[PDB]
């Protein structure tokens, strides 16, 4: 996820579909992004 070109292949099931980051925020890195952001490119 951090390296975005790695996530161009997801290679796994995005499966839970629950409200992310309203949970424990246990992630070492996570970005709550709207439709676009310049750092993606």
């Amino acid at each position: 996820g951090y390296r975005y070109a790695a996530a161009m292949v997801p290679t796994g099931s995005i499966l839970s579909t629950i409200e992310v980051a309203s949970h424990r925020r246990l992630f070492d890195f996570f970005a709550a992004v709207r439709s676009d952001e310049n750092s993606l490119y």
């Binding site: 790695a6 161009m8 290679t11």
Partner: protein, 94 residues
């Protein structure tokens, strides 16, 4: 609804082969499965959604003593394990 079928083969392999190994010592860079994600990103260069995360072969399964239950909708596995692997040591059970 017991005695189901799962994989006995322990789950796959990551090796630092020539895709990794070159990037490993020369730059210090490491990419999980640089083969396809190097290939695919070379081809989309000549014209994320990387759905080749892990779906290759579906390796060999066998049959084990497994206890499944029907909790309403879901098919839920259920096993208790003291006599299995926590038995007779000086390690506490969790």
């Amino acid at each position: 609804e017991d005695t189901e079928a799962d994989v006995p083969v322990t789950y796959g392999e990551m090796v630092l082969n020539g895709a990794n190994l070159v990037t490993a010592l020369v730059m210090g860079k490491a990419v999980r499965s640089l083969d396809d994600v190097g290939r695919h990103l070379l081809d989309m260069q000549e014209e994320n959604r990387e759905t080749l995360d892990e779906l290759e072969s579906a390796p060999q399964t066998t049959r084990v003593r497994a206890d499944l239950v029907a909790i309403g909708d879901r098919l839920v596995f259920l096993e208790a394990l003291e006599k299995r692997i926590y038995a007779a040591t000086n390690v506490p059970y969790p």
